[PDB]
Amino acid sequence: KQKNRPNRLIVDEAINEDNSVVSLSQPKMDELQLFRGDTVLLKGKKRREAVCIVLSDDACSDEKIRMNRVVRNNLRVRLGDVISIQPCPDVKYGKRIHVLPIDDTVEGITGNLFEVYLKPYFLEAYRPIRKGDIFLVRGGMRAVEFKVVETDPSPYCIVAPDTVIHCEGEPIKREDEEESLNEVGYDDIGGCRKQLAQIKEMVELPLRHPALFKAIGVKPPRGILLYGPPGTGKTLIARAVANETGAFFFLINGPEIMSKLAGESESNLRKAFEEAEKNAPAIIFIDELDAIAPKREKTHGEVERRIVSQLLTLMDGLKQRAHVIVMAATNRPNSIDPALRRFGRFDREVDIGIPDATGRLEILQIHTKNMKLADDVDLEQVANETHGHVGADLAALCSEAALQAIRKKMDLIDLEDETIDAEVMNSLAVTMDDFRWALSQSNPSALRETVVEVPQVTWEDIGGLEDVKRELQELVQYPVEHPDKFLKFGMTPSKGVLFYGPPGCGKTLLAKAIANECQANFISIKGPELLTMWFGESEANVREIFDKARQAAPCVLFFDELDSIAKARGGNIGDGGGAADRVINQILTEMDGMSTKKNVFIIGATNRPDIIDPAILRPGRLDQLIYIPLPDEKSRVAILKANLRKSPVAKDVDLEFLAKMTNGFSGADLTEICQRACKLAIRESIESEIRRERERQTEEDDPVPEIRRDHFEEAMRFARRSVSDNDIRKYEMFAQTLQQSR
């Protein structure tokens, strides 16, 4: 019999949320001789079966199958296991079903469960079922499970519209074999994909195949340290990993240990390891490690040092045993004992970090999973206006929105008539106004720290700068792809670039655009940060900056306003000193001593190129000078089009005339003409609306919906240059005399 090649696949994560759709790739589907929508039969561990409608996708391999968590848990398999697939063309429509609830799930549910939950689920969707499964329905701010007990064309069928359901009986007990579905899994973690990938590949072999480490002498990693700001969900990630691998999970925590007597604390710390060890494979989680093992000089007492030393010897005695893994959580790497971050104790480090806007949209979708929002609610808006929020903030935001909806209406309205139950709660919807109320007030964003992400600016927002774009392509994207020519010719690529030119000519845009192109992370350090390090006399924080750059590779490190400190202590005349300062010296030091191939590109920008320290233009540092000049008419047209593409402007306006009229204008000045025109338009519109509201009321004829020629004329009479002729001639002397200095 042939079973290995046509009938074997490997389980992985899902993208769809339906509990019956199983997704696979088109080559396997025309290899299995299966079309879309055909019910398929899956066999897994412990002779369990399931019937599921099939679907095709493209973002898969040719041996991976994507199934949801319900269907996966219904076969007793876990991720990375193998199953058997078959075509089942002999399913028929049912004529009698009987379903029961699980008593652990139904608590405080009053009314009847049929018409609120089982009526919209099997509505206009032919769903297949098999006797003895468990499915899940979401709604009324709860998630209720249901178990099938019988089927009339036994033991499996399809739910047709004329299939009666006898929802008769009392709740049934959850046995000791299946696991609950209110637990944590990888699906309940929004954002943070790369770090999840790292941790999953780091604990795959020791926890899935434990016997393999009795057949080879190879030491797997045993110390993992997660860090990030509080409220980023680290214990979540721990329980998730521990549940998806089926491993045992023990939990130790700081305050509970440090609130006991001496002997009891040591005895608990010892018993945790002993117990943990006995059951295998296991995971031990120590959250708030900073509390129990701080810096040495911060342990002013005596018993604290005993606890730290006890933890040290306990960690050091697991170098032989390969089935136990220890994970811990902190807030920053430099807040714990330095003798812990060594080989054998905590050698792997992961940084969770703050979510990006797409991650924020993911978290908002996670927490409103069974809330029954209205139709006007646009979560993209909310995800774009919560800059500085972590997962706990978004959870609290959704909860506050829900509580405002329950409070405002439907509780005082019915308090004088009847009681509350599930049917009036399921009909309750939340509106966008509640989200705006919760988003306006009572929400202190808890972030004043740096952000690292892939930016949103792209090449289509920059008018002109073609040669600069080409040279940026050459400097950034070649050695990260094709090392062949660089080894063949033996020459090493550069790792720095210095932009210069008149101010307000689009130097930050180029940096953001080239970071977005290569899909590499972006870090920006403005002028005030360097000046804060200068005044405060604490240049030991440059060491932190580069560290983040290193741990988030590939990356782009952008230093704008590099002439800030050189201008602070006098202009070109300066003080009695020279050109050497503290912070730029630390930059030179930290820049010279880094990896020759780590894929970290450093960009500088300055509009006063002469008063900069010439010791940074030496090789091995920023040594590729690029000149960003003032635009020309062919480029001014492109700048104006790029600025105006976002707002509705009429067709009678001619851009070419406005472009040729502004000679010597810097690109940062053509962008405020647009702002002034829009302010005039908004003023005119509000004035006309108020005139209509006050004319009769003390017929939809839009006064003007866009900008016209007269608004541009009024705004253009306020046109202002921003760079003089002498400044251009100074830049041009620097350009002509670019030779015969160094």
Ligand X SMILES: Nc1ncnc2c1ncn2[C@@H]1O[C@H](COP(=O)(O)OP(=O)(O)O)[C@@H](O)[C@H]1O
CA angle 692, 697, 701 (to 5 degrees): 30
Contacts of 301 (CB under 8 A, 6+ apart): none
| Spatial strand order in the sheet of 324-330 | 248-253, 282-287, 324-330, 223-227, 348-351
Pick from 90, 460, 466, 489 the residue near a second copy by CB under 8 A.
Answer: 489
Question: Which of 106, 205, 366, 410 touches ligand X by CB under 6 A?
Answer: 366
Number of helices and strands (H, E) in the chain? 27, 22
Report how far residue 208's alpha carbon sits from residue 78's, in angstroms, rounded to the nearest whole number.
Answer: 10
Which of these ranges, 127-135, 303-311, 372-380, 456-464, lies near ligand ANP under the rule CB under 6 A?
A: 456-464
What residue spans of 427-493 are helical by DSSP H?
Answer: 432-440, 466-477, 484-488
Site for ligand X in 235-264 (CB under 6 A): 235-236
585 is in an annotated binding site: no
DSSP element (H, E) containing 602: strand 600-606
Does 565 bind ligand X (CB under 6 A)? Our answer is no
Nearer of residues 351 and 461 to ligand ANP, judged by Cβ: 461
Which residue, 508, 511, 589, is CA-closest to 545? 589
Segment interacting with ligand X (CB under 6 A) among 182-190, 291-299, 427-435, 497-505: 182-190
Task: Using alpha carbons, select from 87, 88, 91, 89 the residue that is nearest to residue 33.
Answer: 87
When CB distances are held under 5 to 8 angstroms depending on the partner's kind, the choice from ligand ANP, ligand X, a second copy, none that residue 509 binds is ligand ANP
Distances (CA, A) of 339 to 198, 290, 322, 540: 25, 13, 22, 22
Strands in 528-588 per DSSP E: 555-559
Residue nearest to ligand ANP (CB): 667
578 binds a second copy (CB under 8 A): yes
Scanning residues 669 to 708, which ones bind ligand ANP (CB under 6 A)? 671
Question: How many of the other CB atoms lie within 10 Å of CB of 710?
Answer: 12
CA 77 to chain centre: 29
Smallest distance, ligand X to C-beta of residue 260, A: 21
Q: Is 190 in the site for ligand X (CB under 6 A)?
A: yes
Residues in binding contact with ligand ANP, number by CB under 6 A: 17
Using the minimum distance from each CB to ligand X, give the nearer residue, 277 or 453.
453
Chosen residue from 301, 320, 700, 726 binding a second copy by CB under 8 A: 301
- Interface with ligand ANP includes 668 (CB under 6 A)? yes
Residue 464 contact, options ligand X, a second copy, ligand ANP, none, Cβ 5-8 Å cut-off depending on partner type: ligand ANP
Phi-psi region of 622 (alpha: psi -120 to 50; beta: other; left: phi over 0): beta
Residue 233 assigned as binding residue = yes
Could you tell me the smallest distance in angstroms from the CB atom of residue 589 to ligand X?
37
Q: Smaller CB distance to a second copy: residue 3 or 173?
A: 3
Closest distance of CB 570 from a second copy, Å: 5
Q: Determine contact, residues 30/21, Cβ cutoff 8 Å.
A: no
Asked whether the beta carbons of 706 and 476 are under 8 A apart, the reply is no
Q: Which does 508 bind (CB under 5 to 8 A by kind): ligand X, ligand ANP, a second copy, none?
A: ligand ANP
| 582 lies in the site for a second copy, by CB under 8 A | yes
Q: Is 303 in the site for a second copy (CB under 8 A)?
A: yes
164 touching a second copy, by CB under 8 A: no
What sign does the dihedral 81-86-87-93 (CA atoms) show? negative
Options 118-126, 158-166, 227-235, 421-429: segment touching ligand X (CB under 6 A) = 227-235
- Bridge partner residues of 130 (DSSP): 156
Stretch that binds ligand ANP, among 199-207, 315-323, 365-373, 460-468 (CB under 6 A): 460-468
Structure-token pair, residue 171: 């709740």
Interacting partner of 463 out of ligand X, ligand ANP, a second copy, none (Cβ under 5 to 8 A depending on kind): ligand ANP
> Does 294 contact ligand ANP by CB under 6 A?
no
Q: Please check whether residue 601 is in contact with residue 476, taking contact to mean a CB–CB distance below 8 angstroms.
A: yes
Q: CB of residue 528 vs ligand ANP: minimum separation in angstroms?
A: 12
Residues 164 and 152: their CA atoms lie apart, in Å, by 10
Q: Does 667 bind ligand ANP (CB under 6 A)?
A: yes
482 binds a second copy (CB under 8 A): yes
Q: Does 210 bind a second copy (CB under 8 A)?
A: no
**Do residues 379 and 434 touch, judged by C-beta distance below 8 A?**
no
Q: How far is the CB of 609 from ligand ANP (least distance, A)?
A: 13
d(CA 346, CA 330) in angstroms, rounded, equals 12
Q: Which amino acid is at 547?
A: D
Question: Does 485 appear as a known binding residue?
Answer: no
Q: According to the annotation, is 333 in a ligand binding site?
A: no
391 lies in the site for ligand X, by CB under 6 A: yes
Cα–Cα distance measured from residue 199 to residue 238, given in angstroms and rounded to the nearest whole number: 10
Q: Can you tell me the distance from the alpha carbon of 244 to that of 208, in angstroms, rounded to the nearest whole number? A: 10
- CA 539 – CA 527 distance, rounded (Å): 14
Q: Which residues bind ligand ANP (CB under 6 A)?
A: 461-464, 503-509, 618, 639, 642, 667-668, 671
Q: Which residues bind ligand X (CB under 6 A)?
A: 188-192, 231-236, 363, 366, 391-392, 395
Give binding residues for ATP as ranges. 230-236, 331, 367, 504-509
